[PDB]
Symmetry: D2
Subunit: 278 residues, 4 copies
């Protein structure tokens, strides 16, 4: 079970807060933005993860995350000169991927939903690819998919559907070859169409009960932070807390939780971890 | 007119968001935290500013702020090995300060108030020192000052298990040149303490207190909680009252540190969001 | 046979001046009057016959809002009380309404949220005998009824030295024997028939279960201006980000087949100038 | 004599707000810690207006009286008139002809919330205008939804388009005595309503309409929906908590303008002593 996190980009819409800080290290309430797409991968049972970022920020991620062994993970890093193409992920990560299937998630994508893990299990347990769709109200702004669970149409910023394609994708090994033989528009949407034309593209539907934030602007960033702070405070759970997820899925034990909770013992984050482990 | 911004520290209460990012580069809504104490200095007419930070973060501030010439400022930088003592600021910055008076502001202090500039003018136009007091509800947690009617300080208790006032001392201070010598001859506490320096001035009857009461906001960005409160406050004021708080480009323009053409060039890289657009609207 | 009581009186004096001319339980929690929440909680437990107890002055205001509840497939009845002390006085005022049946009791300003709350409530309804109270973790047990459980072990109303972090919430399930308990109950020191006394009695008899609302559950008390705006923010946030409504009686009545799509559409008519009416139309297609 | 007078329009159905307005008047809904009507009322107080007519529905008018009384507790004279909800906001000057008499008159909508350090100065100017009318304009981003005004540099209005866009006209107006006669000789609009906009145009055609500009630093909330209601509440809670002041607190305003003294403040603060509202008032008087 392998996955890739795309954690580069400029976040230019976010100036000036991204002038000296990577977008994916901005706080979403009490956690760095990257904790979220990472937790999404952990929740799907993915433990070997390649993080692709900029030359300048990649060291910052390593300082934050290390090799991920503290959480029972294997984290690797690859710098890209940020040449256009999100589908370039499968090229940069060809070695990492090898012969295995692969999930891909954007570093600024925030997913929430009690049933997301089941949805992701199905996508892992699939040949072909699974994309995740989310009902929006402004399909024009997003890649739109129209589906049967099999995809019918795919229009990058059209609207034949209310469903936007999200930044979470599941591929079988054949994607690496697709990416390598892909003509520049390198677009993930093109790759996804290919699968659809082959009748190998399923669509996981995230409807009522799911939240999906894109952290485009200052506005959505503060809305995301307010959402996480609200859910956590009112419903007594943490969202995308890697230590908690690592513990609940037995990637690590209570003793390791306690050691990790040490440096966090000055705030509610460390305390929550101690409560949890008793 | 000179000032110092203390922008180091660990921000350990803020783990894990400060593990790989300096506290003073965290966003307060649409701006890096350091824009705020910096704007406070600009609003007092201070244009020559020394930023003291850590070895690791100082480069990050330079990448963000440069030499400040884009805003009509002169920004200099000094790394400190973070040896205990906030009053060590006057020692690290002895050369920078020279013979001039000096203001000092903490990098995580966020001040808001229509009349703050007038308050700061008075402090700049003073011998002695001016501290800024803010009415709190839990004086026990803060350095507390009890002052006279003339504005002269009477008492100074760093975290009084027994408070004599509701007024906390904030992280904004104005000193005359004599502070450099005070700092140099200061005995370490049970750290070189800004509170000790402030007492010295008070014992000399040279310490005024600027009062920030009704209409003023003062946020300390201690925790995750206060950080999200600070961000919500800024977003709310800005959206409902159509003004920006602590926007250096706007302040630079309004005080003629720069002209409209320079504003427009700066607004270019920001044109994908409301920040850039606000700056263009402003210059027409 | 499934019956419930909503306590919707009181002064809400902490809430002056907003409660000077408006009942606390008619204050908006985002897009709904406060009373929709505890009412929906009852509906979710399958309770359809509900007695609303309130003040002389406000009872008419509730009736104007809610009617007899037939629009939602319910039977709502009303009883005015002179606010004689005692929340446990509910079982006395409602003795006739209750008759021989079991009974649930909810406070008019209690707001419960949780995907699994309905299952929790099913279990409490399906309890042959005894009572079920609902516990929630609070950081200041001192101002709440405090429970310690195995079946309950200890109960203290506003304990100076609380023995646990678990507050007893304003949602209770009783068997028919509660009416007699209430009638033979001695007023407490403050001169009030106390729900906590009643709950202790059940516990002393080894008949008191505790439903635990832990991770995933929200419980708001609308004590102050602060908590009121927090509750509203919570509801607005959940609804907007997760595309569901919390405690929307029309939705609940439809999903549990108390009413059909045609009735939903008629009810959605007067609400068609806002998202609430539109949500109901979307729902029914 | 010349009496500063004002009218608050506090009826309507608030149908956009169902179901929260099914059994509660819109203007009694809380905006954070105060009934909605405290805000437009405070706006009037801040302009020195102390004689105020509150026009509302048959059903709600008693609820306002229970809340506000005759206003003497705050140094005011409040009077009430119930209208059958007949078409026309400009009908205010007809219903209130007797109340107004020979005086000038301000008019404010019961769901309008104004905030701004300098609002009082703006309002002083409008009260001190010897003749004509003053409307208050607010820069919006969607002029197409609001009455729009286009004005000169002197401050004189040029154009007035009810939902055009050539600045929205807000629900705060200042008139001289001549408005009563304008209202009485006004023809109903196409929707059969006596329109404040028609009245305002008349003044403009006469070159007697000034425009007070509320730009940077001013907030204006309309409490149209559930959304704006919770935004207004958040705004008031935020400003109050972060900046240590209350917005549109009548007791505070009455005290600061000497409508009442410290002893009267303390008596009023008594029933509010279980919350921060009562405590704020006690702190204030020491
Ligand atoms: N490794 C890498 N990742 C990228 C690059 N561009 C974007 N990403 C990541 C960042 C996001 O998490 C995700 C897509 O987000 P966006 O494209 O909206 O972020 P971007 O940095 O472009 O923000 P911006 O469009 O400048 O406002 O992919 C890139 O050139 N290289
Ligand atoms: N240059 C420098 N600045 C510092 C140092 N410690 C704190 N500061 C700055 C950071 C703050 O803006 C201000 C005082 O804030 P704090 O002491 O609460 O920040 P600190 O990083 O200690 O956070 P923490 O106490 O670890 O939660 O002074 C230091 O060792 N060196
Ligand atoms: N029928 C009736 N219901 C009441 C009475 N007192 C309180 N309730 C309701 C209102 C609440 O929904 C629930 C308990 O809430 P509270 O006792 O905190 O409300 P209360 O009106 O006392 O607010 P306050 O204590 O004045 O701030 O029981 C009463 O005297 N009669
Ligand atoms: N006395 C009186 N006042 C009214 C009437 N209609 C509206 N108002 C007040 C209520 C508001 O504070 C102000 C204008 O607000 P709106 O017309 O948006 O409130 P309305 O109740 O019509 O809300 P709605 O349009 O039904 O969503 O004038 C009325 O028929 N009679
Ligand atoms: Mg992009
Ligand atoms: Mg600090
Ligand atoms: Mg209560
Ligand atoms: Mg209307
Ligand atoms: Mg309106």
């Amino acid at each position: 079970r392998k996955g890739i996190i795309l954690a580069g980009g400029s976040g230019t819409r976010l100036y000036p807060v991204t002038m000296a800080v990577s977008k994916q290290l901005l706080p979403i309430y009490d956690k760095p933005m990257i904790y979220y797409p990472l937790s999404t991968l952990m929740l799907a049972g993915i433990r070997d993860i390649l993080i692709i970022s900029t030359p300048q920020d990649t060291p910052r991620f390593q300082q934050l995350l290390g090799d991920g062994s503290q959480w029972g993970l294997n984290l690797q890093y690859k710098v890209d000169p940020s040449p256009d193409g999100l589908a370039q992920a499968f090229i940069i990560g060809e070695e990492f991927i090898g012969h295995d299937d692969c999930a891909l998630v954007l570093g600024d994508n925030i997913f929430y939903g009690h049933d997301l893990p089941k949805l992701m299990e199905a996508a892992v347990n699939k040949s072909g690819a699974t994309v995740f769709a989310y009902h929006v109200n402004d399909p024009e702004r997003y890649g739109v998919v129209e589906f049967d669970g099999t995809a019918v149409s795919l229009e990058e910023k059209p609207p034949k559907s209310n469903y936007a394609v999200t930044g979470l994708y599941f591929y079988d090994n054949s994607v690496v070859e697709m990416a390598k033989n892909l003509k520049p528009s390198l677009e993930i949407t093109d790759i996804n169409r290919i699968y659809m034309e082959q009748g190998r593209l399923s669509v996981a539907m995230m409807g009522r009960g799911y939240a999906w934030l894109d952290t485009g602007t200052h506005q959505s960033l503060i809305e995301a932070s307010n959402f996480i702070a609200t859910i956590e405070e009112r419903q007594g759970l943490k969202v995308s807390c890697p230590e908690e997820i690592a513990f609940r899925k037995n990637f690590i034990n209570a003793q390791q939780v306690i050691e990790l909770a040490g440096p966090l013992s000055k705030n509610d984050y460390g305390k929550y971890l101690l409560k949890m482990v008793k």
